[PDB]
């Protein structure tokens, strides 16, 4: 009947970016201008698609991916970007079709002397493929000597903690992010809008 976007956008907890969450969305109708004309979205960028035109289109499947990153990293959530987040955590394909929605979540996801519950992957042997997810925590080998699962010189736990405090620069504050991706396949299209 109606696509459950409030379920995604208004969730209490958000995933860490390295463990980003995907909600599949099918067999429903929703107004996207509800979202575009919503409030306090500091980023609303679309690719291959216009927000207003989403009401006139039908897609086979629509995925809503959500996670939290730093403010200065929201720019990496875009086709063709590089950096720790795009390379190791959440990668959009070069020909991405969808929208990227972000908003500052400082006073929900920070803490007194720092919230250290959101993590990101700082090390990885190779870059992620688009929409790949890596939740492993194997020790990362930075030199010729193997680590054998022990942290030490050139042997690093691969995740790093976000230093989310109020009084950080706003570029360091947490932002929640939702990425909608749209796919039109041979099968019947069940996500349309009014």
């Amino acid at each position, epitope marked *: 009947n109606l696509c459950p976007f409030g379920e995604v956008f208004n969730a209490t907890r958000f995933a860490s970016v390295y463990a980003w969450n995907r909600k599949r969305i099918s067999n429903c109708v929703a107004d996207y201008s509800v979202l575009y004309n919503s409030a306090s979205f500091s980023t609303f960028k679309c690719y291959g698609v216009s927000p207003t035109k989403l009401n006139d289109l039908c897609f086979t499947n629509v995925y809503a991916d959500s996670f939290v990153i730093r403010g200065d990293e929201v720019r990496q959530i875009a086709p063709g970007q590089t950096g720790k987040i795009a390379d190791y955590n959440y990668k959009l394909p070069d020909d991405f079709t969808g929208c990227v929605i972000a908003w500052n979540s400082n006073n929900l996801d920070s803490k007194v002397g720092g919230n250290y519950n959101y993590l990101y992957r700082l090390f990885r042997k190779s870059n992620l493929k688009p929409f790949e997810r890596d939740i492993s925590t194997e020790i990362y080998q930075a030199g*010729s*000597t193997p680590c054998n699962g022990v942290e030490g*010189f*050139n042997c690093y736990f691969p995740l790093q903690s976000y230093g989310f405090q109020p009084t950080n620069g706003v570029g360091y504050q947490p932002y929640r992010v939702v990425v909608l991706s749209f796919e039109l396949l041979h099968a019947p299209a069940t996500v349309c809008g009014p």
Partner: single-chain antibody
Amino acid sequence: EVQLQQSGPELVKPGASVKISCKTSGYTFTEYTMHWVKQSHGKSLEWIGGINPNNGDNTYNQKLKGKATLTVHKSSSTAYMELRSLTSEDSAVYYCARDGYPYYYALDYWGQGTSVTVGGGGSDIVMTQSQKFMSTSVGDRVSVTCKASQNVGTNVAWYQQKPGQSPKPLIYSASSRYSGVPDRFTGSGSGTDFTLTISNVQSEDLAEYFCQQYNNYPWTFGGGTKLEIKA
């Protein structure tokens, strides 16, 4: 073209301290870990420690009992080693060298060396080259053996050194050749027994040959085998 240019010789007397540099070029400095190796005159190679230049992380051979400290200067792409409380036993040639991981393992480029003149841990791996000198004839097939006191898998490298030069990397991962190394050189072995084989030995193979393990810290080297080549 990678280059590690080290600073010039030093003469000191007991109790004082030395700081030597290693200026790099030809590659992105922060992408490769730098190691330091000591060679006492006529003696074998000893690993001092390493430093990851991207984050400043470092480690040291406990044999040095804390007398070395490694630093880097990312701006000038330069690594430093400072030695303190120098004694008679610290006179040696000191090398910087680059860990080539993840492409060519172990020490794929070396500086030219810096002359400085004035038992181990129970779990340290000992690499034994039981032959110190071999004489063969041109054209022979030569086998240099190296035994590890503990299993080191295939994390073994071989180097070649001619007098007055830094070691030249020949073999890593027990059996792979570094760039530009002739096919006459092959390495074999796994576990604890390793061999370097030179097929059809030539005059330019006159050198001393060293094995090394990088399976565990401290990195350790065999004692070296000098190869003399006669007509």
